[PDB]
Design a protein around this ligand. Structure first.
Ligand SMILES: [Zn+2]
Ligand SMILES: [Zn+2]
Ligand SMILES: [Zn+2]
Ligand SMILES: [Zn+2]
Ligand SMILES: [Zn+2]
Length: 143
DNA sequence: ACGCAGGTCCTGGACGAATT
DNA sequence: TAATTCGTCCAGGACCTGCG
């Protein structure tokens, strides 16, 4: 089971050169599954079929409680926790709990105090990019 | 006023599982 | 078994919203 072919990008081992070339597509994108609409590339054909719904607006995962539909089954699973009051994600620092995992991750950054987004007009610094974008509307409306 | 931050759901890379 | 395809988790983000 010796493997002598290595990828110079991630270091993974392969027994045949043909296996290394097939893997190397993950770094170059060459010959990866390509969407016929936008020509962006994905790691396998299943991820491509998933992305295909972004062009059709199909939402095949419907909540049986409220009737709303979602593009991904994981999104429906996260949404169902709202109905059930299930908040398994908690900030270890202050104890605030969330049903949404990204809401928890986003909140925990506030304990660091980092504000890496600075308004190019007035210099006001924000912890989040979406709040900086909304702040810049104030300058556009001022003009 | 508007800065703050939580609510919500879309997007796709990661990676083991299932299928071919 | 190896290659391919699938299911799923997860990270990141956009848009929305009311509070102080
Ligand atoms: Zn590699
Ligand atoms: Zn596309
Ligand atoms: Zn619902
Ligand atoms: Zn906290
Ligand atoms: Zn500004």
């Amino acid at each position: 089971g010796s493997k002598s072919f290595t990828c110079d990008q991630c270091g993974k081992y392969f027994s045949q050169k043909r296996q290394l070339k097939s893997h190397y597509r993950v770094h170059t994108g060459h010959s990866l599954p390509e969407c016929s609409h936008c020509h962006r590339k994905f790691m396998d054909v299943s991820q491509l079929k998933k992305h295909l719904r972004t062009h059709t607006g199909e939402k095949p995962f419907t909540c049986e409680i409220c009737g709303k539909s979602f593009t991904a089954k994981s999104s429906l699973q996260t949404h169902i926790r709202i109905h059930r009051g299930e908040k398994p994600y908690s900030c270890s620092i202050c104890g605030k709990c969330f049903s949404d995992s990204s809401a928890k991750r986003r909140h925990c950054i506030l304990h660091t105090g980092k504000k890496p987004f600075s308004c190019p007009e007035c210099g006001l610094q924000f912890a989040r990019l979406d709040n900086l974008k909304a702040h810049l509307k104030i300058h556009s409306k001022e003009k």
